[PDB]
Structure 1
């Protein structure tokens, strides 16, 4: 899912029903523009907050000298020994102590979770 913008005028699309076809469309009340809406969802809501933070932690965090780093856990793709580890920051979850690992060598921006 995501927002999309009208071709005529760089303003936000929002959904409507074509009651002549009985088929969905996007439209833009700033102008006279109609578009086919291929994404069958208009609104989704991840109530439980299911997410693991791999999509939010960055590889640049490997350069932080105040983070801890162990030789215990190797990276998958390269197998460099050094990997900095740190905790979760997401609040809505069943758990609060799991460690997120980032491979320490600057060429290997790989991140994984044990």
Structure 2
């Protein structure tokens, strides 16, 4: 879901319906600014969310001395050095799958063999 913001006053643009064209238009509630919508999606409820699994990865993640090291091979550069950490989602419903960050290309891959 994308929250478009107004051009003239920066306020968020809520969806509105025009019966003359039966199209989707985003309009402002204060300054009367309109724009044609690019997508027909208006709400995205994610009960089972995969977002945040790899949150916090930075350009210098390998510099962290606490993260463990591994010898698994990165399948994009043929490198053996990498740091792995479990999913960052704290809800007690996630699997113990790992996520490996390569120290040579900053690529993120997983060791899971079920869904990948």
TM-score, normalised to structure 2, is 0.80
Question: How far apart, in 2, do the equivalents of 1:95 and 1:32 lie?
Answer: 45
- Structure 1 residue ranges without an equivalent (≥5): none
Match of 1:10 in 2: 10
Q: How far does the alpha carbon of each residue in 1:79-105 deviate from its partner, in whole angstroms, 9 at most, with x for none?
A: 121111121121347543211111124
Shift of residue 109, structure 1, vs aligned partner: 0.8
After superposition, the Cα gap between the structure-2 partners of 1:51 and 1:7, relative to the gap in structure 1 and judged at 3 Å, is closer
Match of 1:112 in 2: 109
Match of 1:64 in 2: 64
Higher strand share: 1
Question: How far apart, in 2, do the equivalents of 1:5 and 1:76 lie?
Answer: 40
Match of 2:89 in 1: 90
1:101 aligns with 2:112: no
Contact 2:25 2:37 in 1 (8 A): yes
Q: Larger deviation: 85-94 or 2-11?
A: 85-94
* Equivalent residues, number: 110
Greater relative contact order (Cα < 8 A, sep 6+): 1
Question: How far apart, in 2, do the equivalents of 1:98 and 1:36 lie?
Answer: 42
Q: Secondary structure at the match of 2:37?
A: coil
Higher helix share: 1
Q: How far does the alpha carbon of each residue in 1:29-64 deviate from its partner, in whole angstroms, 9 at most, with x for none?
A: 11121111121001111111144724x241422111
